[PDB]
Amino acid sequence: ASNFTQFVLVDNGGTGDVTVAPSNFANGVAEWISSNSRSQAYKVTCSVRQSSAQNRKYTIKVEVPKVATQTVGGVELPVAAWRSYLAMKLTIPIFATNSDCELIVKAMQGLLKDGNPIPSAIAANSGIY
Amino acid sequence: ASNFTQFVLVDNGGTGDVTVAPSNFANGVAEWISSNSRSQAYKVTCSVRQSSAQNRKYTIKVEVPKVATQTVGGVELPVAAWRSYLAMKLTIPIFATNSDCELIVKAMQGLLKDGNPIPSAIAANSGIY
Amino acid sequence: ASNFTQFVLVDNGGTGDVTVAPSNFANGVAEWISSNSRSQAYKVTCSVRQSSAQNRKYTIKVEVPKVATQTVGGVELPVAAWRSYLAMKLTIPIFATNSDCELIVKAMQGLLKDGNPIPSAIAANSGIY
Amino acid sequence: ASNFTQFVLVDNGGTGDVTVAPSNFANGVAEWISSNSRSQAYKVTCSVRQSSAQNRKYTIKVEVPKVATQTVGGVELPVAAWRSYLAMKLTIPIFATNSDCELIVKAMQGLLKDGNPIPSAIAANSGIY
Amino acid sequence: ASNFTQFVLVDNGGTGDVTVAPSNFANGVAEWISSNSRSQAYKVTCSVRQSSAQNRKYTIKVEVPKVATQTVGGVELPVAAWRSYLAMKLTIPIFATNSDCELIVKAMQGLLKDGNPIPSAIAANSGIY
Amino acid sequence: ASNFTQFVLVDNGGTGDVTVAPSNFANGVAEWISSNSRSQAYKVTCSVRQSSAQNRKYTIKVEVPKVATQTVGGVELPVAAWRSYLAMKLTIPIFATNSDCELIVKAMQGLLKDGNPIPSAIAANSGIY
RNA sequence: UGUCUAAGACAG
RNA sequence: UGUCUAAGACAG
RNA sequence: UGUCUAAGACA
RNA sequence: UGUCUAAGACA
């Protein structure tokens, strides 16, 4: 209905939340960044296109800063040591109804819900065991 | 512990939930599938690799099917009308602390939380505008 | 005396039990078939032969059908939607005594006993994990 | 959760029981080995793979040794006089539900249940008659 | 019996011990890491395979962090300056009984017991003299 | 001081102990052997090298034999039925403090301490699961 | 790197 | 990198 | 589809 | 040693 708005990316219960806001719409790709230097910010981008005859495809990217021992506003090199990148690609058949899509979103939420396998592994620098 | 446990992939309040369970770990790829014919099952796979000398990369995949009954050769078989695919690559630097990773997980959770931009667009067959 | 008798292949309480009976013994190959439409029957075959100077070799095979009705042109027939195939080869040296053989059989029964790894993986459309 | 655990391969009351434990899982091939001299150990291996578009295939193997002492040049070693080899292939279509699989397993257990044809022939160094 | 559990790697008498816990079981290789960023953690991995016809071989690896002047959670480069690596390879003939193996373990313990030559040399940045 | 001293490699409480002593230091490789015929002796060797411009590498080896009496040409000779080999490479950065090294030694000691995962698996001819 | 018959070897 | 019929693929 | 010393092989 | 429609097959 007009969803390109600011939102809470990292929720720490009001006090200490990381908020992300619209920062670019070039080429139809929506971008959101936290209030930092681009080298230390949280960034989120998203776009959809019909990847093929039968499928539509969402491409979502997220960049999370390494905070431990960080120096706010400083020049931290090498860049690859201070940043994590998430790249999501959601392929959805053109036959999926709004309902079908609502379930796909739920599957994604369940996948990452706190306490489940995957998020528990990532959050502990671990694999599956 | 052991993080290789079953979990509810799609939550619909107790009943109607889509729960998925450990099914394979061959070749270092942890697999979870729902209780159905291998042809109609929901599937989730996860794996971690030391992608670089200073990087670790998680590869996660989810397969949400649209079940159906197809008649092949006059006989009916349990099949999937089509499948939706979620593929995410997560690259975390080896210098990332546990708290640093907890931050990445929170970000992904925040990203897909009901009400926020992206999950809203996806659930309505729409882009961000 | 005879061991080419009918037996219970699948036990489901008292009723719902699949029984298979002797049907053919051509070429030293014993064959058992469940009743009714040969097309939807369970099949078991067995044979032994001196595979070499010091070895005897058993060849056991089992076919479990997926009962169904095929309709083509309005004509319907009792068929098997598909079949699951089991084939085992058992090599036993000529030095094995009756005791040694009784042990080999216990090993086979243990391998498929309820609760153990292999039978549990199969019954859940899974592998080892 | 895990099904790559140790189990009782041969049951002989409470004592005299052969137990086999996880030892290796390279190349998607699960392997169990009984304790003591690897040379006189029982071995079990298992694996699954998509054998075709509509079929998955299991490969189970078991080795039962004939414990003995080899003496050569006055030096003696724990060896296996000989080994009995079991090898089974199980093909299951992707349309099989959990129920269908549970049935296939019951068929296998029935095939080797005490008293029935096949297990009795094997345990008596015999064929069908 | 089920040994993949957490244990004390560096014992400093309760207070100040370094504990290591299961963190991965991909490919059958057991991994244990301390609670740190992977760049600063203690890591232990282990696996066994039959290296040849007559031998089994254990491969054990350990990574110990350089702690003096360390900055917890910081990005320390070059990696090679802040880490020590131990790589053990234990070859055992298939004729070794549990007893034989128990003695091999004792030999390893004696080799590293406090006060003996080897550990005394390593602990003093020395060679043998 | 002089760290080149004899020590008890295998401890069995005063009596039955396997003690090994300095035997050679030719070519910079310190050797210790038990008091037996060179053919049945336990052997331990150690050496240190400045492997890199910023690294030092220790190479340690232990040979545990299985003594036996073989009859060759009608005559009996003291021999080893087989040998077990332990080979470990330890790489420590030149920036490692004495306390840093004491940490590495403690880790290796903790690794092989009775009751812990690895020594337990080894002593039982088993893997970690 | 990996393997062994093991401070010397072999197949990268 | 991208795509799919999806841990395996194809066109860089 | 088969054999052996068996996840490697040999036809 | 392997695949399938399975005691017949196909490499």
Q: Do B24 and B31 form a contact (C-beta atoms < 8 A)?
A: yes
What is the domain-level CATH number for residue C82? 3.30.380.10
Strand order in the sheet with D75-93: C7-10, C18-24, C30-34, C43-50, C55-72, C75-93, D75-93, D55-72, D43-50, D30-34, D18-24, D7-10
Phi-psi region at C7: left, alpha or beta (left = phi > 0; alpha = psi -120 to 50)? beta
Separation in Å: J1 C1' and D86 CA? 15
What 3-state DSSP class applies to C80? strand
Taking alpha carbons only, the member of B55, B81, B57 closest to residue B68 is B81
Q: Does A92 contact chain B (CB < 8 Å)?
A: yes
Sign, Cα dihedral of E113, E115, E118, E122: positive
∠ CA B34-B35-B37, nearest 5°, is 105
A38–chain E nearest CA distance, Å:
19
B113-to-A1, A42, B120 alpha-carbon distances in Å: 17, 17, 9
Whether any strand I atom is under 7 angstroms from the Cβ of D46: the reply reads yes
Q: Which residue has the tokens 């996860």?
A: B46
- F–A contact (≥3 CB pairs within 8 Å)? no
Q: In whole angstroms, what is the distance from residue C66 CA to residue C80 CA?
A: 5
Beta strands per DSSP E along chain A: 7-10, 18-24, 30-33, 43-49, 55-65, 83-93
Q: Does F125 contact chain D (CB < 8 Å)?
A: yes
**Between chains, do D48 and B24 touch, taking CB under 8 Å as contact?**
yes
Q: Does D19 contact chain F (CB < 8 Å)?
A: no
Q: Containing domain of residue E43, as a range? A: 1-129
The amino acid present at A21, given as its one-letter code, is: A
∠ CA B93-B94-B100, nearest 5°, is 70
Strand order in the sheet with F30-34: E7-10, E18-24, E30-33, E43-49, E55-65, E83-93, F75-93, F55-72, F43-49, F30-34, F18-24, F7-10
Resolution in A: 2.8
How many structural domains comprise chain E?
Answer: 1
List of residues 6+ apart from C61 with CB closer than 8 A: C43, C44, C45, C46, C85, C86, C87, C88
Tokens representing F19 are 């003690």
